[PDB]
Symmetry: D2
Subunit: 332 residues, 4 copies
């Protein structure tokens, strides 16, 4: 049995996570789930967004499935639940996928999470400001090895996007990426971000595993969303040494919570990434989504008038149908 920690969060988080968990249960009985509370209410009651004993159980889980959390502008002493989990679980890498639901093409963008690669300081001393940024071989290797394993797993290659023409840290990172990839027999292409943005708009689907330090990579990960009809479809993973946390890119959207119209696709595809991470059949979820959207009604963020449940049921129906066609969907 794999043990998955479930952290629904706030607002639409619980709604979409219910859909994702129901989908996972429809594909495999090899996972069981334990649920945990986190957010402002937990902070009020214990001084931290998540309880220390819940964190300990989470650390020992095989994967985490996370919904979304509402973080107030200024609640003294409070720190974002997702930022806490990334820090406490050592989740140094973030992998975002923009899927083309019609075809199964994707844009894969790997960056470090906050403080996962660079450090240093910024300050004013009026009349002048300074920023210093430092990167090490050890930090560069760690994220390079991750992206390299991800490319290997996909039968793919790396597109390393950067500003090595201006920033020596980027030149350094590029060299390390090329070294690590070379060891593993994985092709590396590289590009200056400025011109690469044109390619990401015009030819998005053919860049393999995009890797960029987050100063530039977070630009790419947002720019790539122009190819999604809604942010509500977009999944992501947060990866560390021996554990990963999967979450939709969308937020807690408190203003539509309880309206039954949250897009569950992002959370459901995040579950598909979770299954892949555990060596299970994430592809069945993707094929089921693609099947559903051919003629299936979608939620209002995608221009349809489905309820969340209509989409969750319709996806589960596709999964069922595939699982029943023993000749068409064979094991492994």
């Amino acid at each position: 049995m794999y043990r998955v920690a479930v952290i629904p969060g706030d607002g639409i988080g619980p709604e979409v996570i219910d859909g994702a968990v129901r989908v996972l249960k429809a594909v495999t009985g090899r996972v069981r789930f334990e649920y945990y509370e986190g957010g402002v209410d937990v902070f009020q009651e214990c001084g931290s967004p998540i309880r220390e004993e819940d964190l300990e159980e989470i650390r020992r889980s095989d994967a985490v499935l996370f919904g979304a959390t509402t973080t107030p502008f200024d609640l003294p002493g409070y720190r974002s639940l997702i930022l806490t989990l990334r820090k406490e679980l050592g989740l140094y890498a973030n992998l975002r996928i923009i899927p083309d639901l019609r075809t199964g093409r994707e844009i894969v963008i790997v960056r470090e999470n906050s403080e996962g690669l660079y450090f240093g300081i910024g300050a004013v001393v009026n009349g002048r400001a300074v920023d210093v940024r430092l990167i090490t071989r050890e930090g560069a290797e760690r994220i390079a090895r991750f992206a390299v394993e991800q490319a290997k797993a996909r039968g793919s290659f790396i597109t390393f996007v950067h500003k090595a023409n201006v920033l020596t840290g980027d030149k350094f990172f590029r060299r390390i990426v090329r070294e690590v990839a070379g060891e593993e027999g994985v092709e590396v292409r590289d590009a200056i971000i400025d011109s690469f943005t044109i390619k990401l708009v015009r030819n998005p689907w053919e860049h393999g595993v995009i890797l960029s330090e987050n100063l530039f990579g977070d630009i790419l990960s947002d720019l790539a969303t122009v190819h999604a009809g809604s942010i509500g479809i977009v999944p992501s993973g947060n990866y560390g040494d021996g554990i990963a946390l999967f979450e939709p890119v969308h937020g807690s959207a408190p203003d539509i919570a309880g309206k039954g119209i949250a897009n569950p696709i992002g959370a459901i595809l995040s579950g598909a990434m979770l299954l892949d991470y555990l060596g299970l059949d994430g592809s069945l979820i993707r094929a089921a989504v693609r099947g559903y959207v051919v003629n299936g009604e979608l939620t209002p963020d995608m221009g349809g008038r489905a309820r969340t449940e209509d989409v969750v049921r319709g996806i589960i129906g596709e999964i069922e149908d595939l699982l029943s066609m023993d000749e068409v969907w064979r094991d492994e």
Copy 2:
């Protein structure tokens, strides 16, 4: 008389600049032109891409019209002609325009030229790399005042795009921009580059004067070109204290030089920026271009089979036609 220094350059530079100069002569007799050589051939013969006595005459001119220059990968001692001119003439600001030729809408992107705003160092000391970047109030004010005057002139506003969330230099620059704009009664909007990229793809034409330090602004200035059918239409200006140099964004394209198919629109619209800069009727050039492209055949980079001359003549024809319609195109 205004005195304009003309520096045709190499490859297609002379071809497109001939078109631009012919266009300028069609709108005004208040400018006369002096021509200057520059590039590799001048370097071979005198050790610098441009002669020191030619530079002196150029410094005293009212504006510079520049074509394009071929810069070899490694010619020991050689330094790019356009980089030399930016440096020697103190051209600290670059303003790029992506025009919508059907309508007259535009995307205006202001960044500093190389070393126009930030300084500091980058280095490796293996196992670690560092970058330090420094900005001052004086440098920030200078480019802010430029963008603010540009917004005032356009009856517009500034969209300041940045990474102030990560880089203190950007926070500092933002504050200075807001101060200078506030003094001049010019509205400032600001945006983090990551999300702004989505707006620049989806709603490009309604951002006023975009200002961004070049580390991010050069991303924007390339990304904005997705809205141009060809780079060959795109003009730019390089501005300093008391002189400016106008040039197409396109390069010297030596492989099509002499084929009579270079797009002259970028150079011609750069001439239109030059006329605006001198207080002359640049708008007549723009209206003439827009008129020509309604039904006019375009060069092969825009999917037509016109020669450069067909487009140059057709534009001049429009200018003539407008200048003859005394009721439709009145003075000032």
Copy 3:
């Protein structure tokens, strides 16, 4: 029983440490000693200057008494034994004492050990070099609290020596020292190093606990030795959280090893610091040294022709004599 780990080292280290241990045994039976090997010979046989199992026993000891170690110019893979121990035991503070043996006056100089306070990088990128240095509140507080406890223990005060006029890190450190001292009711004087050097030459004995970051403090700790007849008298301590290592400032002096002329005073006074650290009667050692030097013959580094043993015996004789005078040397 207190448990002291003894690491004699090389050259004269074993010779002087024998004297120190014999002295400690003459004052107290409340300490027992365990001996450990370390240096090049241990490296040859196990790839590290000290065995990992010996380190583990050392970590659990109450104090460490260290002689001196010979570190070759370049022995690939080798790292100094004393540098290893400082690192592995987290010994962030170094306290050097220059004693006036005639009187019992002292110069006390506290600095951080390597990387105990500042970090950052230095690099060339030819034509330019850069150094970046970073200090944090947490690191500044830690060494400040140490020096403050040391001043309290001595019934003294802190002289904080710096270059706050030039380096912001020093200004920052000074402010933290003043805050911590203020909390504990300990007086802080401060001085720019440049002028302070004159006072340290002319009036050395009246500065209390001198505290300076090592960039300047290591200058002071060497300059202060002009008041010692020989480096061979000078003790020191290396302090961490819950353990400390005491060692003479002198080195392994392999060229006089076996000649029976090494000055044992530095090691013996380092033992006296060790006893103070454990709450035992270090003062008895100091009084015994002072008594011996009144008329006692000293080793050749101090202009006498005593052997090491003559001095060790003569000191132990003084200790014995004091311990026998129950009216003159009373408990506590």
Copy 4:
């Protein structure tokens, strides 16, 4: 005729400068003097410590003789007169001499003046502070060439004192000093400041031309004064491209102004440096001072009860006596 600009300053400045000028007039008629006002009174009357028209005349002079200036703790808008002159005249190098008046031995210490070599920033962003320091080849060469010419002129060598073991800027500077010296056939010794301080106390007179960046070199230049009976004897020069300003190290000492007890030796020896700088007979001044102090009464800062005038007259008497002994003091 050489033209020397005289800037007496405040307090004891006028008193000691009168002595120096009288001494110069006693050795040569090849100099004439023009006097200029500067300080707080000039600031009150014109918004700058020195008048712009006086600065212009000063720039064209062959040398400057400067007394001392009183700089208030906080007079809004005011900037130190000597700091202004160093800046405005481009006086990048400072050479301090500690003389042994009994013998004619000296300690020569060369450092850059403020911002003469290093730049960069220091800042807090609370919880952390940073300092960045940058040096260039061009700045390093400039001061290296100065110290190298000074060593050549003295028939001497350079002792380069530094912290190259910790600071890469120092390592860089050391390499440049070694290169420049090597070209000119001048020996370079180098030393880490920490240990060098011991040598400067114990063996001060045998280090040739000491060169150190001011972060460390200003330590040395103060520490070296332990070998002077009073700061009042110590001269200095401030050197730039084509002009130099000579001044005593002592200050304006307003509390003894008008008491007739200011030591004129520092100013007089600064005049001797001025004459050397112009190719004139500074040595005659030094020999005359040394002669006077053999049995001559000195001012109260040196433990005598002479008035300033007694010392000025006694020195001039020695100069006269030497100039009359045509066999003992021959030309050149």
